[PDB]
């Protein structure tokens, strides 16, 4: 099932490949290879890389 994370800080992307988010946004984690994870925004449905230390995993 879905890995859900909550943003602890705002993050501004400088690239179409990276995903901007605001503190408190929830995201689904699609890939966790290294420290930059691929995620999808539940708000905007846009997808891309995020800094994993800006988010907290919740649930289960």
């Amino acid at each position: 099932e879905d890995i859900i994370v909550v943003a602890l800080y705002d993050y501004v992307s400088w690239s179409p490949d990276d995903l901007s988010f605001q503190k408190g946004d929830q995201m689904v984690v699609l890939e966790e290879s290294g420290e930059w994870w691929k995620a999808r925004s539940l708000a905007t449905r846009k997808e891309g890389y995020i800094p994993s230390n800006y988010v907290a995993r919740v649930d289960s």
Binding site: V12, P51, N53
Partner: protein, 127 residues
């Protein structure tokens, strides 16, 4: 008036105390350098800035602090004349200007879209 890449970088170095963690390190690539070039072009503040070694370091540290790129990718070919970026993808070059009397070269940062397609550092050297 814009909202400047230079003024943000400069203010971060002076205060030095972020409200959020340092993003993880990741390697520089052609696509990241290209994307950062376009972002800073559109943001404003780097185009036309008068070059110094300290200014370049301030900007490199800001890019490192914000996006995680270790600050050793922003190198240029040696003078004299135009200095071309050694990292292919980075679309800024350093251009001599008329001093507006010295005599050391005053340089400005200049965006150049042809740098996305012509690795001039390599098409003009061999290292």
């Amino acid at each position: 008036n814009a909202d400047s890449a230079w003024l943000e970088a400069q203010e971060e170095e002076e205060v030095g105390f972020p409200v959020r963690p340092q993003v993880p390190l990741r390697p520089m690539t052609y696509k990241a350098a290209l994307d950062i070039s376009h972002f800073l072009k559109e943001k404003g503040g780097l185009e036309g800035l008068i070059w110094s070694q300290r200014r370049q370091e301030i900007l490199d540290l800001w890019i490192y602090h914000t996006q995680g790129y270790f600050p050793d990718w922003q190198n240029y070919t040696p003078g004299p004349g135009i200095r071309y970026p050694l990292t292919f993808g980075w679309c800024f070059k350093l251009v001599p200007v008329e001093p507006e009397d010295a005599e050391k070269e005053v340089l400005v940062w200049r965006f150049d879209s042809k740098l996305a397609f012509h690795h001039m550092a390599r098409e003009l050297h061999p290292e």
